[PDB]
Amino acid sequence: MLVKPPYSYIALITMAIQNAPEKKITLNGIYQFIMDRFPFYRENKQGWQNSIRHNLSLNECFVKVPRDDKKPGKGSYWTLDPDSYNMFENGSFL
């Protein structure tokens, strides 16, 4: 018998980052984690994969930190962070 995870789609995205060997994980990498942790999704591939991407955009809780554009191939990472866009410098603003 198989049972789906009572975890909501948003919670699954949150758990994947926590159990991700690397805090920065690609969108494609997140799908692989769910397939192994929960095999019920393997029976149904199309449908749930797209919904996760839809949330990974409207929700501002997640922060996208792409690698340098010079390196091709993968170009997207997911991690938990605030609006740390220019927080690189401190003391410049009060």
Side-chain angles (χ1 to χ4, degrees):
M1 190 184 281
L2 300 174
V3 295
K4 310 298 198 317
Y7 313 129
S8 183
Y9 285 104
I10 300 306
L12 290 171
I13 293 170
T14 300
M15 290 180 184
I17 303 168
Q18 292 185 116
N19 54 62
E22 183 67 15
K23 293 278 174 292
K24 291 180 180 174
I25 180 168
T26 71
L27 181 57
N28 290 332
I30 290 170
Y31 301 134
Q32 183 176 45
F33 177 90
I34 291 170
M35 295 169 194
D36 287 334
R37 189 81 173 167
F38 310 104
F40 336 126
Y41 292 86
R42 289 180 54 164
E43 290 180 272
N44 291 331
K45 298 180 181 189
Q46 294 180 94
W48 71 271
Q49 290 180 162
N50 290 340
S51 294
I52 296 300
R53 310 191 216 164
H54 180 67
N55 288 112
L56 288 170
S57 51
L58 292 154
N59 298 312
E60 297 178 3
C61 290
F62 300 109
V63 182
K64 192 189 294 82
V65 262
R67 17 175 48 165
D68 290 340
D69 290 340
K70 290 180 180 56
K71 179 173 188 169
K74 292 171 273 276
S76 282
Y77 282 122
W78 292 111
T79 189
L80 295 172
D81 270 302
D83 292 340
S84 46
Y85 211 123
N86 292 115
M87 283 292 139
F88 284 81
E89 310 79 4
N90 296 130
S92 86
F93 64 90
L94 300 178

